[PDB]
Swiss-Prot record:
Included stretch of the parent chain: 408 to 445 of 687
Disease field: A chromosomal aberration involving PATZ1 is associated with small round cell sarcoma. Translocation t(1;22)(p36.1;q12) with EWSR1.
Name of the protein: POZ-, AT hook-, and zinc finger-containing protein 1
Taxonomic classification: Eukaryota, Metazoa, Chordata, Craniata, Vertebrata
Family: Belongs to the krueppel C2H2-type zinc-finger protein family.
Provenance organism: Homo sapiens (Human)
UniProt subunit comment: Homodimer. Interacts with RNF4. Interacts (via C-terminus) with TP53; this interaction inhibits TP53 ability to activate transcription.
Domain of life: Eukaryota
Subcellular localization, as worded in the UniProt entry: Nucleus
Record function comment: Transcriptional regulator that plays a role in many biological processes such as embryogenesis, senescence, T-cell development or neurogenesis. Interacts with the TP53 protein to control genes that are important in proliferation and in the DNA-damage response. Mechanistically, the interaction inhibits the DNA binding and transcriptional activity of TP53/p53. Part of the transcriptional network modulating regulatory T-cell development and controls the generation of the regulatory T-cell pool under homeostatic conditions. (Microbial infection) Plays a positive role in viral cDNA synthesis.
Expression by tissue: Ubiquitous.
Stretches annotated zinc finger (C2H2-type): 13-36
Length: 54
């Protein structure tokens, strides 16, 4: 029951976001920065802000 365990013969650079595929590094990048591009929240400019953590 494998029916898998294979890739694509041509475009090795496969997007690690959706699964797309490209031939060049820059080409794929644009897609990840043109389609996947988005904004995400970050820490308060520090590892721990509260009383303690770890
Ligand atoms: Zn993608």
């Amino acid at each position: 029951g494998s029916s898998g365990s294979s890739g694509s013969v041509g475009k090795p650079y496969i997007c690690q976001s959706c699964g797309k595929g490209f031939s060049r590094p820059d080409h794929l990048n644009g897609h990840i920065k043109q389609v996947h591009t988005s904004e995400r929240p970050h820490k308060c400019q520090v590892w721990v802000s509260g009383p303690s953590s770890g």
